[PDB]
Design an enzyme around this catalytic site. Structure first.
Site, PDB file in Angstrom:
ATOM      1  N   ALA A  82       0.774  -1.233   0.000  1.00 16.31           N
ATOM      2  CA  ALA A  82       0.000   0.000   0.000  1.00 16.31           C
ATOM      3  C   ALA A  82       0.809   1.289   0.000  1.00 16.31           C
ATOM      4  CB  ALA A  82      -0.957  -0.011   1.179  1.00 16.31           C
ATOM      5  N   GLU A 108       5.770   2.688   4.833  1.00 13.70           N
ATOM      6  CA  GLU A 108       6.666   2.964   5.952  1.00 13.70           C
ATOM      7  C   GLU A 108       6.465   4.401   6.419  1.00 13.70           C
ATOM      8  OE1 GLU A 108       8.315   2.341   2.575  1.00 13.70           O
ATOM      9  OE2 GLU A 108       7.543   4.392   2.501  1.00 13.70           O
ATOM     10  N   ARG A 109       5.733   5.185   5.627  1.00 14.27           N
ATOM     11  CA  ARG A 109       5.464   6.579   5.956  1.00 14.27           C
ATOM     12  C   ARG A 109       4.177   6.770   6.775  1.00 14.27           C
ATOM     13  NH1 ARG A 109       7.219   9.794   0.303  1.00 14.27           N
ATOM     14  NH2 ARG A 109       6.778   7.836  -0.824  1.00 14.27           N
ATOM     15  N   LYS A 131       1.970  -5.075   3.524  1.00 18.72           N
ATOM     16  CA  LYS A 131       3.135  -4.225   3.736  1.00 18.72           C
ATOM     17  C   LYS A 131       2.691  -2.777   3.617  1.00 18.72           C
ATOM     18  CE  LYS A 131       5.978  -2.067   1.427  1.00 18.72           C
ATOM     19  NZ  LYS A 131       6.054  -1.057   2.526  1.00 18.72           N
ATOM     20  N   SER A 171       3.178   4.373  -6.924  1.00 19.02           N
ATOM     21  CA  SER A 171       3.665   5.114  -8.094  1.00 19.02           C
ATOM     22  C   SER A 171       3.817   4.240  -9.333  1.00 19.02           C
ATOM     23  CB  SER A 171       5.012   5.766  -7.775  1.00 19.02           C
ATOM     24  OG  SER A 171       6.002   4.782  -7.525  1.00 19.02           O
ATOM     25  N   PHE A 198       1.100   5.742   0.766  1.00 18.59           N
ATOM     26  CA  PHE A 198       0.992   6.594   1.945  1.00 18.59           C
ATOM     27  C   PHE A 198      -0.250   7.486   1.930  1.00 18.59           C
ATOM     28  CE2 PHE A 198       2.501   9.979  -0.830  1.00 18.59           C
ATOM     29  CZ  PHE A 198       1.801  11.079  -0.333  1.00 18.59           C
ATOM     30  N   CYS A 235      -4.668   9.729  -6.002  1.00 19.57           N
ATOM     31  CA  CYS A 235      -4.687   9.112  -7.326  1.00 19.57           C
ATOM     32  C   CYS A 235      -5.929   9.562  -8.097  1.00 19.57           C
ATOM     33  CB  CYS A 235      -4.703   7.594  -7.190  1.00 19.57           C
ATOM     34  SG  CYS A 235      -6.098   6.986  -6.216  1.00 19.57           S
TER      35      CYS A 235
HETATM   36  N1  NAD Z   1      -4.622   4.082  -8.903  1.00 19.78           N
HETATM   37  C1  NAD Z   1      -4.666   3.727  -7.606  1.00 19.78           C
HETATM   38  O1  NAD Z   1      -5.414   2.820  -7.186  1.00 19.78           O
HETATM   39  C2  NAD Z   1      -3.781   4.444  -6.603  1.00 19.78           C
HETATM   40  C3  NAD Z   1      -4.304   4.662  -5.177  1.00 19.78           C
HETATM   41  C4  NAD Z   1      -3.356   5.286  -4.192  1.00 19.78           C
HETATM   42  C5  NAD Z   1      -2.105   5.770  -4.640  1.00 19.78           C
HETATM   43  N2  NAD Z   1      -1.736   5.559  -6.020  1.00 19.78           N
HETATM   44  C6  NAD Z   1      -0.412   6.144  -6.413  1.00 19.78           C
HETATM   45  O2  NAD Z   1       0.505   6.054  -5.305  1.00 19.78           O
HETATM   46  C7  NAD Z   1       1.528   7.132  -5.390  1.00 19.78           C
HETATM   47  C8  NAD Z   1       1.670   7.754  -4.057  1.00 19.78           C
HETATM   48  O3  NAD Z   1       1.973   6.687  -3.101  1.00 19.78           O
HETATM   49  P1  NAD Z   1       3.502   6.418  -2.612  1.00 19.78           P
HETATM   50  O4  NAD Z   1       4.260   7.685  -2.669  1.00 19.78           O
HETATM   51  O5  NAD Z   1       3.560   5.694  -1.309  1.00 19.78           O
HETATM   52  O6  NAD Z   1       4.087   5.360  -3.739  1.00 19.78           O
HETATM   53  P2  NAD Z   1       5.429   4.479  -3.856  1.00 19.78           P
HETATM   54  O7  NAD Z   1       5.399   3.718  -5.134  1.00 19.78           O
HETATM   55  O8  NAD Z   1       6.522   5.413  -3.416  1.00 19.78           O
HETATM   56  O9  NAD Z   1       5.250   3.482  -2.620  1.00 19.78           O
HETATM   57  C9  NAD Z   1       4.065   2.602  -2.571  1.00 19.78           C
HETATM   58  C10 NAD Z   1       4.537   1.272  -1.956  1.00 19.78           C
HETATM   59  O10 NAD Z   1       5.696   0.888  -2.805  1.00 19.78           O
HETATM   60  C11 NAD Z   1       6.836   0.627  -1.974  1.00 19.78           C
HETATM   61  N3  NAD Z   1       7.958   1.151  -2.734  1.00 19.78           N
HETATM   62  C12 NAD Z   1       8.338   2.438  -3.110  1.00 19.78           C
HETATM   63  N4  NAD Z   1       9.454   2.476  -3.818  1.00 19.78           N
HETATM   64  C13 NAD Z   1       9.885   1.212  -3.953  1.00 19.78           C
HETATM   65  C14 NAD Z   1      11.052   0.607  -4.625  1.00 19.78           C
HETATM   66  N5  NAD Z   1      11.951   1.322  -5.269  1.00 19.78           N
HETATM   67  N6  NAD Z   1      11.128  -0.777  -4.521  1.00 19.78           N
HETATM   68  C15 NAD Z   1      10.248  -1.565  -3.881  1.00 19.78           C
HETATM   69  N7  NAD Z   1       9.123  -1.043  -3.229  1.00 19.78           N
HETATM   70  C16 NAD Z   1       8.976   0.353  -3.288  1.00 19.78           C
HETATM   71  C17 NAD Z   1       6.577   1.440  -0.670  1.00 19.78           C
HETATM   72  O11 NAD Z   1       7.270   0.940   0.431  1.00 19.78           O
HETATM   73  C18 NAD Z   1       5.058   1.557  -0.506  1.00 19.78           C
HETATM   74  O12 NAD Z   1       4.516   0.505   0.358  1.00 19.78           O
HETATM   75  C19 NAD Z   1       1.009   8.099  -6.520  1.00 19.78           C
HETATM   76  O13 NAD Z   1       1.780   7.939  -7.734  1.00 19.78           O
HETATM   77  C20 NAD Z   1      -0.464   7.680  -6.726  1.00 19.78           C
HETATM   78  O14 NAD Z   1      -0.970   7.998  -7.999  1.00 19.78           O
HETATM   79  C21 NAD Z   1      -2.570   4.872  -6.979  1.00 19.78           C
END
Ligand code: NAD
Ligand code: NAD
Lengths: 484, 484, 484, 484
Positions: free
Chosen positions: C148, C177-178, C174, C227, C150, C282
C-alpha cells in the site's frame, strides 16, 4: 375456394373439429385471404395431452442440443425475411418497411433464446458448512400457453415460444384469429429447423381455446399479450386456477417534448410513433406533452410532417400509413374523433377526410387542447389519433403521464441530463426512451411495463422470461470426508 | 503444383513478403499438401496497423449487429462440418470421427460467443447517493493477438477470435505452422458470414511473427495456447511488454480409478483419453492411478481393449489411432519409451512394434510399476504413451497427481459421493471429470487449468474470456433535480 | 523513548529481526511519532510460511462463517471512526473531515466483502448432455501479498485484505513505511472481530519486504497500489516469477469544464479534487481543460476560491489544506513550480508564497496557459499544483487528456447528454465522473483505471477483486440413471 | 397485571383501536404471557397510509445508506441471541438450542439483505445501435405486506421485511397472533439500528388485518407464509386485487433411505427432522421411505433414539421435545393418531402415553405399514407424528413422494452418486437435502418449494426475493455525437 387453416398439433397439420370459421381479410383491400377455425376445447385438450407427452422427452434433450435448434431456426427466419414481411403486410396492414422491422425483432428474440445454456445456470458453492456443498438448478415447468395479439403477428409470438422451448418446455400457441397466417410460416420453419413433434403446438381460435388454456391442468404457465380488459381477465382466471401468468396489456404512452428538444429528430420520431402501423402499437405515442416555449414551433412542424403522409396499400412504396385492422375498429376510431369534439378538444388535423374505401383506412388525426378529463386521453384508442397537451415544464408533464392508469412506455426529447434523471426517477412507465419515438427495449431486456399495462411479477423477454419459464431446485448435500 | 498459402490482411489474401516457406505434410502419408510462408515482421507490422485501423470502425458497430454476423458464421461452419473435419484429419492426423468432434466444439465456441450482447452487460444503480447514479460498461481493448498449437487446428482458434471479435476487438491469429489449412477455411467462412475487412487477420509463420505480436504496441492482449516452455516465455515477454496475456500450457492429466468403478465404461473412456488423437491432447490421460483392489482386473481389460486398437490413416474406416504430427515427434516418443525401461518401468504394451512406415506411426504403449521419480511421469510425452500406478486409496492417488508440476485436468471413476467431493476439494487440476475420460468443459465454462498448465488470471472460454478480451469504464454522475 | 513498531505475524506482535529503523513523523509538526522497522527477507519468510500454514485451516472455514467475522469487523471499524480518522490525520496530514471520509470508504470495502457468499457462487447446469451435469466453483488461491501507498493509510489496505480474507486466502500486508500507525489499529480490530491467528499478517518495511513478497513462491498473488515506476516494476518482477499481479499506479486526471457547466458546483468540486489532501491523491484533479467561452469567469471564481484556502494542522477545524507528506515532496513541488515558470507556464496562484515551516507546508498553486509539452503536464506532481488549459471544445479537451500516458480518472462538468455520451465513449480513463470532482467509484464497482494507471487484467474492488483473489475448478460428471 | 401489546406505526408504539384482545400463552406451562390486539381495518388503513407516506422519502435514501442500517441491525440481533432465543422458546415451545438456531438463520437473512447494493444492480450496454445506449434499473415497488406463521416467530419474518426495506420499500408485518413477542423485539432492535419512522410497521391481528392487507391499494406486494388453505386463499384474493403475491404453504416432506445409508448419521438426522420443534416445521420429515434391505435395521435404530427423547419445558436442559403450539393442535394430533390406527397403520410408537399435562405435550409417535391411501399420509399433521414405508428401490420411493400433493422438501440418505442425480432429476420437491434431515437452503438461495407448497413465481429469499420486492425500468437513449 377459401383455404381453411388447420391446427398444428404433435408434428403435423390436423383439421379442427369445429363448424365455426372466421374470414381473415387484407385490411387494405377487404380481400378474403383464408378461413380461421374457431377451435373447440376439444382441440385444446388434444393439444395439451400432446404437449404434456412430448414434454417428457423434449425436456430431457440437453439444453446445448436444444439451443442448436434455435440457431437453425434463427437462420431459417433470416432467409425468409421477404416472405414473413409479406405475410405481415397483407394480413396486418403495416407497410413493408415496418413489417420487415418486425421480422428483425422477432429474430432477435430467437437469437437471445439461443443463448439458453448460459441463461439457465444456477448458483453453486463448494462449502457453506463443513463437508456441506450447495447449488441450485433450473428446470422447465412443463407445457406453456401463449396468447397473441393482432398488432404483431410475428414478434409477440417470438417473445414466447422460442425462449420457452429452448428452456425445455413444450408450447401451445393461440395466435390472433385476425392475423393467423404468419404463425403458420413460423411452424413450418421451426419444423425445418429440426424441432421434434409435439414441442411447438398451434391452436387457432378465440374464447374456447383461451379458457381451455386457462383451465387445463397440464398448462402450468400463461403468457398473455393483448388488451387490458382481456388481459386482466386472463390474469385473474389463471391465478384462480393456481398457475403463473404474465399479462402484458394496454398502453397510453406519453412523449414529453422540452424546450431544448431537437425538433427535426423529434417530429419525425413522434410522427412515426403515433401514426406508424396505424398507431396499433403498445409502444405507440398516444399523447404528447410539449413545453410552452417550444410548443408553437412543434405544432407547426408537426402539421407539416403529418401533411406528407401517404395512405394506402402497405405493399406500395411511398406508403407511410396503412389501414386499421378491421371495419369494427375504423368505426370506433371515428367515434372517438366524434367524442373528442364533443368533449371540447380542438381538431388540428382531421383523419375522417380524404380516405379511400378500398380498405379500413383512417387518416392521421391530432387533437389540441385536451385534458385528463377527456375520454380521448383516458382511453387507449389504438389508431391514428394523437392528442397534444401544453405543459409548463417537465414536472407537470410527468404528473399528467402518471395520472394515466397505463404505464407501458414514455419518451422524453431533450439534451438535459438533469431532466433525464428526473424523468427516469419519477415517471411511472417502465419502458423509457430518450430521444426515441418508440421506447421498446431489445430482446435481452425485459419488456417492463407497469400499472394497468402489466399484471404479474416477471415480464416477457430478458432474464425475466427465463425465470418465468423455469422453476428452481436447490441441493444442499453433506459428503463427509472419508478415512484412510 | 504445390499451392503456397497466403496471409489474410485487411479482408484479402496477400503474398507474404518472405522468401522462406515451410512444407505442410500429411502425417499419415508423408506427402506435401502445401507450403506455409514463414512471414516476416514487416508482415506482422502491416497486420497490426490495418487491424488497429479496422478497430476504429468495427468497435463502433453495435454488439447486436456484430453478434448477428456470428450467427451466420455459426451456420456456415455447420454446413461444412465434413470439409472442416477432412482438413483437420489431413494436416493433424486424427480420424474423421474425432475430427468431426473437434469441429462441433469449435462451433459451440461461436454459439457461446453469439450471445455477446448479454455477456457484455455491465452493472447499473439508479442511486448510490442522492442525485447520484453510477454504472460501468465493457469495451473492447483493441487488437487481440492469438497464437495456436497443432493438436487442435480448429477448436483452439475458435476459443479466441470469435469471442474477441464479437466483443468488438480486431484479431491477428498466428495458427500452428503444421496445421495451417483449417484456419484458411475459417477465414473464408467468416468472410462469407459478412465480417468487414481488417477485423480477422491471419499471419502465418513462426518466431519472427510471434515476437512481432509480443513487441508490437498495438496488440493489447495475447492469448497463447501451446507447450509450457513456449507459453512460459510468451507470458513473461508479454508481461514485460506490459500487455495482458493468458498462456494455456502443457499437461500430465491423471485419472483415478477406485474399486467401485464401472470397469467397462472406465476402460473405454481411459483408452480414448490416452490414445485418441495419438495422445496429442492437453486433456489426454497420461497417468492412471488404480486402486489396489481393482488393479489386476483393470489392467486385464485395458490391455484387452488396447489390443483391438487399429492404427492407420485417419481417413480410413476402422482406424482408431492415427499418426503423430512430425517425424521428430515419433523419435521423441521412441526415446521416452526407452528412458522408461531404463528407469525401471515395466513396458506392459509396446508401440514401437507393428507400426507401418507410410506415416509417422507409433502404436499405443503402456508402462507399469512407474513412480514419481521417473521422467516418464514428470514429462508430457504428448503421444500415445500411458503410465499406470497402483495406489492404496483415493488419498494416495491425489497426492501423486498433486505432486505433478502440471494441473490441467484430472478424472475420477467412482460412484461414491464422498470420494467425489474429497477429490474435487483436494485435487489441484482445475478441470475435473467424473466418469468421463476427457474432462474438457463446454464453451460456456472457463477452461480452468492450473499450476504449470496455466499462466495468468483469466482462462480461455466462459465469462473469463469476456473479461480478458474487454475492459471497463465506470461512470458516477450527479444530476441535481431541476428547479420547478 | 520513540516507540518501535513490531510486525504482526501469526496473530502476535513480534519485533523485527532488523537493525535498520525509520522515523515516522507528523507532516504538520515534524514531530516524531514512532519508529518503523525496515524488516528483512527473514521477517517476510516467517510471515509467508506462517500465512501458508494457516491457509490450510482458514480456507476450510466455510464462507458464511468467514463473512460473519467481516460483519463484526465492519462494526468495530464503525465504532472507532474518531480514532481511525485521528491516526490518518496525524501521520498523513489530511484534515479530519477528509480523514473521516477515508474511514467511511474503507468500511464500505468491508461491507462489500461481507457479501462474499453470493459473490463466490459459480455456475451450475443439471444437464449439458444426457446423464451429464456440470458446475464450476471458486476457491481461494493461497497467500496474497498487499503493498500500500501513503496517501490512504486505511482505505487502500481495505481494498485488499478484507476481500481476500473473506474469500478464503491468508494475507501479508506491507503498509507504507510513511503511514504505518493506522494498520496497527486495523489489526487490533480485526483480531477483536474474531479473526484467527496467521490469517492477517503485517510486515512493515520497504524494498526487502517487497522483493520477498515478489520472490516467495508461497505468495500466489500480489496487489500493488503506488507510483508508476514502482508498480511497473512490481508487475514485471511478479510476472517473471509467474504469479498473478495487479498494479494500480499513478495518474494525471483531467477535468473538462464546458460552457454549460454550473460554475458554483464546478469550482467547489475542482478545488477539493485539486487541493484536498494536499493533492496527494490518485483521483486528484491535476489538469483542467476549460472551454473558451466560460474560461475567464471560471478562472476568476477558481482563483478567488483558492486564495481563501486555510493551510494548517489537520486536527484544527477550519483548516482546508494540510501538509505534503515529506520534506522531499515539498522540495520536489517547489521544483515543479519553478519548472513551470521556466517552461512558459503562467502563475495564477503562487504556492511558494506564505507557507509555515512548522511542517512540510506548501500553499496551493495554479498555472494557466500550459501545454502538453510542459513537464508540468507530463508528470504527476502529486501535490497542490493545478494546471489549466483553454480548449475550443469537448473534442479538443478529450484529445489532450488522451495524450497523457495516464488514464486513471477523468471528469466532465456539463448538463449536455450528447457531450456526456461522447465523453464516455472516447475518453481513455476508466473512472469517470459527471459533475463530481473525484470520480472514485464505490467498493461494489471495480476501481478501473487504464494505460499507465493500471497494469494487469483485473482491478481492485468490485467483482474484479473477487476473480483476482480466487481460481476456479469446473466439474463435469456422468452419473448414469440406474436400472430398477 | 398482563401486558397489552401495541401496534407499531410510524416509528411509534400505539394502542390498537380494537376492544378485542387475545391471550398469548406459553405452550409448555399454559401461563398467559401477555395480550395481543386483534386490530381493526382502521388500524391497517392507518399503517397503509403511513407506510405509503414514508415510502416517499425512504425510497430516496440511496441503497448504500439503507444497507448501513442493515449492518447495525445485524449486529444488534447478534448481541441479543439469548434474549431472542428465550422469547422464541416461551412463545413457540422449541428448546433453547433450536431457538438459537432460528436466531442464527434469521440473522443470515439480514446478512444477505445487507448486500442490497450489488443485488439491485441492473444491466447496462454502451451501444445497442449507433449512438444509442441502454440499461435497466431496479426500484422498490412501494408498501409490502407480510403475514407470518407461528412455527418460526423470528426467521420467517426475517425472510421478508429486512430485504424488502433494504431494497427501498416500506413494510407492514402481521405476525402470528400466537407468537407476537419476538416481532416486538425485532421492531425495537431495528429502531435502535437507526431505521426511520414509517419504514417498518407492525399491525397485530387476525382476519380483519389480513383482509386489509389484501384489499388496500397502497400495498403492492404480499408475502404469505402459512398453511395451504389460508395461503391458497391469500394468493387468489391477492391476484384478484391485481397485486403480486407469493404464498409459501404446507408440506409433507419425504426422506428416502437407501441400503448404503449411514444408519448412525441418518437416524439422528431423521429423528431431529421429524420430532424437533414438535414437528411443527415446513421442512420437517413427515414420511420416510426405506429400502427393504436396510428397513429392519433402520426401524430398530430409530426406535432406540426415539425412546431416548426427553420431553418437557423448552428452557429446561436435557429437553429435546417441547409442546405443540395449542390445545387444538394437541387434539388434532391425537385425532390423527386415532385415524391412523383406524386406517390400518401399525402404531409402532405411541406418543399419547407418558405425557405431562403442564403444557400441550404429545410424545413422539411413529406409524408403520402406512400407505398412500391413508389420511396420515395425505395430510400435513404438523406435529410429532412420523410415518414409515418400506419400498423396493429409489424409483418407488420417488414415485410415492411425487404422489403427494405437497413438494416442499425431500431428503435422500445415500452415498451413491448415481442415485443422487436420479433423485434430483425426478423428485418434485424444490428443496433437496442429501444426507441431511432438514434440507432448508441458506438465505442466499431462494427457498424453492413446489406443487401445493408454493403459489407464485418467485420464492422467498435468494435473488428471487430481490426480484419479487422490486420492479424494473429500462432506458434506451439516443445521444448523437455533437458536431465539432
Ligand atoms: N490508482 C490507484 O489505485 C492508486 C491509489 C493510491 C495511490 N496511487 C499512487 O501512489 C503514489 C503515491 O503513493 P507512494 O508515494 O507511497 O508510492 P510508492 O510507489 O513510493 O510506494 C508505494 C509502496 O511501494 C513501496 N515502494 C516504493 N518504492 C519502492 C522501490 N523502489 N522498490 C520496492 N518497493 C517500493 C513502498 O514501500 C510503498 O509501500 C502516486 O503515484 C499515486 O498515484 C494509486
Ligand atoms: N491447456 C490448453 O488449453 C492447451 C490446448 C492445446 C495444446 N496445449 C499444449 O500444446 C502443446 C502441443 O502443441 P505444440 O507442439 O504446437 O506447442 P508449441 O508450444 O510447440 O507451439 C505452439 C505455438 O507456439 C509457437 N512456438 C513454438 N515454439 C516457439 C518458440 N521457440 N518461440 C516462439 N513461438 C514458438 C508455434 O509456432 C505454435 O503456433 C502441448 O504441450 C499441449 O499440452 C495446451
Amino acid at each position: 375456394e377459401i383455404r381453411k387453416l388447420k391446427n398444428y398439433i404433435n408434428g403435423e397439420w390436423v383439421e379442427s373439429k369445429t363448424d365455426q370459421y372466421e374470414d381473415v381479410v387484407n385490411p387494405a383491400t377487404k380481400e378474403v385471404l383464408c378461413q380461421v377455425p374457431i377451435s373447440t376445447k376439444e382441440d385444446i385438450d388434444y393439444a395439451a395431452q400432446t404437449a404434456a407427452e412430448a414434454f417428457k422427452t423434449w425436456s430431457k434433450v440437453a439444453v446445448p442440443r436444444r439451443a442448436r435448434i434455435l440457431f437453425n431456426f434463427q437462420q431459417l427466419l433470416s432467409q425468409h425475411k421477404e416472405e414473413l414481411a409479406h405475410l405481415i403486410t397483407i394480413e396486418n396492414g403495416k407497410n413493408t418497411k415496418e413489417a420487415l422491422g418486425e421480422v428483425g425483432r422477432g429474430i432477435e428474440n430467437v437469437e437471445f433464446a439461443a443463448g439458453a445454456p448460459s441463461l439457465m445456470m444456477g448458483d453453486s458453492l463448494a462449502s457453506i458448512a463443513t463437508d456441506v456443498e450447495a447449488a441450485n438448478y433450473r428446470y422447465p415447468i412443463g407445457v406453456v400457453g401463449g396468447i397473441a395479439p393482432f398488432n404483431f403477428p410475428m414478434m409477440v409470438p417470438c417473445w414466447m415460444f422460442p425462449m420457452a422451448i429452448a428452456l425445455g418446455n413444450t408450447f401451445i400457441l393461440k395466435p390472433s384469429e385476425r392475423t393467423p397466417l404468419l404463425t403458420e410460416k413460423l411452424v413450418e420453419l421451426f419444423e425445418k429447423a429440426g424441432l421434434p413433434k409435439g414441442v411447438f403446438n398451434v391452436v387457432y381460435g378465440a374464447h374456447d381455446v383461451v379458457n381451455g388454456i386457462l383451465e387445463h391442468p397440464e398448462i402450468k404457465a400463461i403468457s398473455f399479450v393483448g388488451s387490458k380488459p382481456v388481459g386482466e381477465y386472463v390474469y385473474k382466471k389463471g391465478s384462480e386456477n393456481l398457475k403463473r401468468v404474465q399479462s402484458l396489456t394496454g398502453a397510453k404512452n406519453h412523449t414529453i417534448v422540452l424546450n431544448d428538444a431537437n425538433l427535426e429528430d423529434t417530429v419525425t420520431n413522434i410522427v412515426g410513433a403515433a401514426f406508424g402501423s396505424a398507431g396499433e402499437r403498445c409502444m405507440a405515442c398516444a399523447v404528447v406533452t410539449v413545453e410552452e416555449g417550444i410548443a408553437d414551433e412543434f405544432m407547426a412542424k408537426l402539421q407539416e410532417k403529418v401533411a406528407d403522409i401517404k395512405i394506402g396499400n402497405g405493399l406500395d412504396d411511398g406508403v407511410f400509413l396503412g389501414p386499421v385492422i378491421r371495419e369494427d375498429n375504423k368505426k370506433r376510431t371515428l367515434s372517438y374523433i366524434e367524442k373528442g369534439l364533443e368533449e371540447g378538444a380542438r381538431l388540428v388535423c382531421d383523419g375522417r377526410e380524404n380516405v379511400s374505401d378500398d380498405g379500413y383506412f383512417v387518416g392521421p388525426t391530432i387533437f389540441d387542447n385536451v385534458t385528463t378529463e377527456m375520454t380521448i386521453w383516458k382511453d387507449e384508442i389504438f389508431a391514428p389519433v394523437l392528442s397534444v397537451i401544453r405543459v409548463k415544464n417537465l414536472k407537470e408533464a410527468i404528473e399528467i403521464a402518471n395520472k394515466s392508469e397505463f404505464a407501458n412506455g414514455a419518451c422524453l426529447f431533450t439534451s438535459n441530463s438533469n431532466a433525464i434523471r428526473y424523468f427516469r426517477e419519477n415517471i411511472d412507465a417502465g419502458m423509457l426512451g430518450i430521444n426515441l419515438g418508440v421506447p421498446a427495449p431489445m430482446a435481452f431486456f425485459p419488456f417492463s411495463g407497469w400499472k394497468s399495462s402489466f399484471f404479474g411479477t416477471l415480464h416477457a423477454n430478458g432474464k425475466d422470461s427465463v425465470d418465468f419459464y423455469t422453476r428452481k431446485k436447490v441441493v444442499t448435500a453433506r459428503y463427509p470426508a472419508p478415512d484412510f
